[PDB]
Enzyme design. Structure first.
Site, PDB file in Angstrom:
ATOM      1  N   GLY A  50      -1.353   0.744   3.022  1.00 42.47           N
ATOM      2  CA  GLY A  50      -2.714   0.503   3.464  1.00 42.47           C
ATOM      3  C   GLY A  50      -3.632   1.696   3.294  1.00 42.47           C
ATOM      4  N   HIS A  80      -6.801  -2.535  -7.704  1.00 43.09           N
ATOM      5  CA  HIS A  80      -5.638  -3.401  -7.520  1.00 43.09           C
ATOM      6  C   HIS A  80      -5.747  -4.269  -6.266  1.00 43.09           C
ATOM      7  CE1 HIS A  80      -3.896   0.248  -5.337  1.00 43.09           C
ATOM      8  NE2 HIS A  80      -3.707  -0.710  -4.449  1.00 43.09           N
ATOM      9  N   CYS A 122      -4.580   3.020   0.502  1.00 47.70           N
ATOM     10  CA  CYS A 122      -5.307   3.045  -0.759  1.00 47.70           C
ATOM     11  C   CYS A 122      -6.808   2.993  -0.503  1.00 47.70           C
ATOM     12  CB  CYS A 122      -4.867   1.890  -1.666  1.00 47.70           C
ATOM     13  SG  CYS A 122      -3.259   2.248  -2.390  1.00 47.70           S
TER      14      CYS A 122
HETATM   15  C1  LIG Z   1      -2.136   1.147  -1.475  1.00 49.17           C
HETATM   16  O1  LIG Z   1      -2.332   1.172  -0.060  1.00 49.17           O
HETATM   17  C2  LIG Z   1      -0.661   1.498  -1.757  1.00 49.17           C
HETATM   18  C3  LIG Z   1      -0.338   2.936  -1.196  1.00 49.17           C
HETATM   19  C4  LIG Z   1       1.142   3.285  -1.295  1.00 49.17           C
HETATM   20  C5  LIG Z   1       2.055   2.357  -0.479  1.00 49.17           C
HETATM   21  C6  LIG Z   1       3.141   3.210   0.143  1.00 49.17           C
HETATM   22  N1  LIG Z   1       2.627   4.583   0.045  1.00 49.17           N
HETATM   23  C7  LIG Z   1       1.503   4.667  -0.756  1.00 49.17           C
HETATM   24  O2  LIG Z   1       0.866   5.672  -1.026  1.00 49.17           O
HETATM   25  N2  LIG Z   1      -0.349   1.439  -3.199  1.00 49.17           N
HETATM   26  C8  LIG Z   1       0.424   0.441  -3.767  1.00 49.17           C
HETATM   27  O3  LIG Z   1       0.852  -0.447  -3.038  1.00 49.17           O
HETATM   28  C9  LIG Z   1       0.758   0.387  -5.256  1.00 49.17           C
HETATM   29  C10 LIG Z   1       0.141  -0.824  -5.912  1.00 49.17           C
HETATM   30  C11 LIG Z   1       0.149  -0.807  -7.423  1.00 49.17           C
HETATM   31  C12 LIG Z   1      -0.316  -2.179  -7.973  1.00 49.17           C
HETATM   32  C13 LIG Z   1      -0.713   0.310  -7.968  1.00 49.17           C
HETATM   33  N3  LIG Z   1       2.219   0.405  -5.452  1.00 49.17           N
HETATM   34  C14 LIG Z   1       2.980   1.407  -4.940  1.00 49.17           C
HETATM   35  O4  LIG Z   1       2.591   2.419  -4.363  1.00 49.17           O
HETATM   36  O5  LIG Z   1       4.330   1.260  -5.088  1.00 49.17           O
HETATM   37  C15 LIG Z   1       5.139   2.167  -4.539  1.00 49.17           C
HETATM   38  C16 LIG Z   1       6.515   1.572  -5.045  1.00 49.17           C
HETATM   39  C17 LIG Z   1       6.881   2.247  -6.367  1.00 49.17           C
HETATM   40  C18 LIG Z   1       8.235   2.881  -6.027  1.00 49.17           C
HETATM   41  C19 LIG Z   1       7.980   3.967  -4.989  1.00 49.17           C
HETATM   42  C20 LIG Z   1       7.795   3.245  -3.720  1.00 49.17           C
HETATM   43  C21 LIG Z   1       7.716   1.774  -4.141  1.00 49.17           C
HETATM   44  C22 LIG Z   1       8.838   1.728  -5.205  1.00 49.17           C
END
Ligand SMILES: *[C@H](O)[C@H](C[C@@H]1CCNC1=O)NC(=O)[C@H](CC(C)C)NC(=O)OC[C@H]1C[C@H]2CC[C@@H]1C2
Ligand SMILES: *[C@H](O)[C@H](C[C@@H]1CCNC1=O)NC(=O)[C@H](CC(C)C)NC(=O)OC[C@H]1C[C@H]2CC[C@@H]1C2
Lengths: 297, 299
Positions: A141, A39, A143
């Site tokens: 960040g 992603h 991921c």
């Molecule tokens: C990649 O660094 C992030 C890691 C997340 C961000 C906050 N805590 C984590 O573990 N992943 C994402 O940004 C991911 C992207 C999609 C395209 C796979 N989206 C995500 O984690 O969304 C979290 C959203 C979903 C609901 C819970 C918190 C918010 C709303």
């Protein structure tokens, strides 16, 4: 008796930064390939329903910036395996450990090296929940951070981080890019199946409390395996299999407490509670220590 | 919240084994010096009350086996500083990080790289209790394992492991060889002071609960620091120091809750209890997350 992670040095030597557009996350650099969540190629518009094959064919090697510290690595090729992007680079990582990619089973534990901008920040021990989430500390960040176990000189990579769920738990893939659980790498609020407690691990942890001279919850009673499993399932504990019983043997022998005797103690705890008391400092039954974890410590 | 350790790789790169006769423990190789517990020079018969100074005069450089893995490091000098042996070696460790030796305060947390025969086994987070013991996982042969914090890319070494107490907790020194607490490196029964709760860390936990929107326990009042400390002692809580007040600064600023107002909230929890309620999903107050730990995992 506390949570203990594997030493992280062999994995730290593999972490790099991967940027595409305005999106930056971590990659894992093994030999001449950098693995990261696909992603990274998304934008805000893309994220809600990303057609990854479309988004990827529209990218060239030069759209990916890979940094090992201050040093940029040159991307000479890119491909996608399920939810992981693989970037071929012109340089091999001399710090590559002996490794393998494994898919772990629910109830197994692993260490997580939490990274931000390609830099290691912390390490901790996680369990794959039965509903295929993990209770982690992952922030924006993180991921591309990976989970792993170490056997002899060999690093078994089992997890790469991709997302958070509304409940605050986390979801990700194996290093072949297949999610654990029913989750999808799109920007939506996703719920997991109903979680259950990992019974064989609760039993390992009770044995640990006993080994640490702690036994108020013990009893003389006993139970059959099936009668224990009836009560366990009533309380959304996983049923205990005979291989689970077998795996608890060494802890059984070492304490002289039959596995099914410890089952009778756990049954009493589920039905009554801890009634103010604690076990190994905890007011709750802990299920993220495997029998192996307990033994080795 | 998790107990989370620092990445261990920079410390792994410094671990060696040090052997005298059949006694092997771990040492820490930084530049051209190896640091390790002085009781490596003891036999069984010497351990009840070693005469360390006499034991050392009998030793020469060639009596010390220092190994990184299976590769021997030649010792070219030896001295004793308090309870640590310093062995000058003929090779500067190419993996030496930027580092400091720091002496930590009770209540501070650090990571321990548990090592056996110079090989790392695991990493975990410890808190130094107010009685100057730690609750580690240390088995035979873990002596010389170290505790550390990492700031930027500088490793601050704060602990070196030497012994276990009858109660099962552990004691050791800083990297200048000065024990934490009233302990000595002799194989004798020694008792720690009765332990107390780390008030500053409990306050950090309450701040963490507020940051996460869990704030039923905030009240409209305040207290003086001395009034709080006198009540806290009656519940076996550590009194707060000025340094404790200061390291709560950032969390107080992040929440807008004055330190002394949070102390007034804690006092109320101590005197009235929780009355069936939870904080961060726990009926128990947690005291092993420092103000630094909380900010790391929240922000
Ligand atoms: C990649 O660094 C992030 C890691 C997340 C961000 C906050 N805590 C984590 O573990 N992943 C994402 O940004 C991911 C992207 C999609 C395209 C796979 N989206 C995500 O984690 O969304 C979290 C959203 C979903 C609901 C819970 C918190 C918010 C709303
Ligand atoms: C060095 O690796 C060991 C580590 C100990 C052993 C088990 N757990 C540990 O932390 N240290 C010692 O062996 C130490 C040597 C002396 C010279 C300081 N002895 C020790 O810790 O013994 C503790 C005494 C106190 C009562 C418990 C066991 C004996 C009696």
């Amino acid at each position: 008796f506390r949570k203990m992670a594997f030493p992280s040095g062999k994995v730290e030597g593999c972490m790099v930064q991967v940027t595409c557009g305005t999106t930056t996350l971590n990659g894992l650099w093994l030999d001449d390939v950098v693995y990261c969540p696909r992603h990274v190629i998304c934008t805000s518009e893309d994220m809600l329903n990303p057609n990854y094959e479309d988004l990827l064919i529209r990218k060239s090697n030069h759209n990916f910036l890979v940094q090992a510290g201050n040093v940029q690595l040159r991307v000479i090729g890119h491909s996608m395996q399920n939810c992981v992007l693989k970037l071929k680079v012109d340089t091999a990582n001399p710090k590559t450990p002996k490794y393998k990619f494994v898919r772990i089973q629910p109830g197994q534990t692993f260490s997580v090296l939490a990274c931000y901008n390609g830099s290691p920040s912390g390490v901790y021990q996680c369990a794959m929940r039965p509903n295929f989430t993990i209770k982690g500390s992952f922030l924006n960040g993180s991921c591309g951070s990976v989970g792993f176990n170490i056997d002899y000189d060999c690093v078994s990579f089992c997890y790469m981080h991709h997302m958070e769920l509304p409940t605050g738990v986390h979801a990700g893939t194996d290093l072949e890019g297949n999610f654990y659980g029913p989750f999808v790498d799109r920007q939506t609020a996703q719920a997991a199946g109903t979680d259950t407690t990992i019974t064989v691990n609760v039993l390992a942890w009770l044995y640990a409390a006993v080994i640490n001279g702690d036994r108020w919850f013990l009893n003389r009673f006993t139970t059959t395996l099936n009668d224990f499993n009836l009560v366990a399932m009533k309380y959304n504990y996983e049923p205990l299999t005979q291989d689970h019983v077998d795996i608890l043997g060494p802890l059984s022998a070492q304490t002289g407490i039959a596995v099914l005797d410890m089952c009778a103690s756990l049954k009493e705890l589920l039905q009554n509670g801890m009634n103010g008391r604690t076990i190994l400092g905890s007011a709750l039954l802990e299920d993220e220590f495997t029998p192996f974890d307990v033994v080795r410590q």
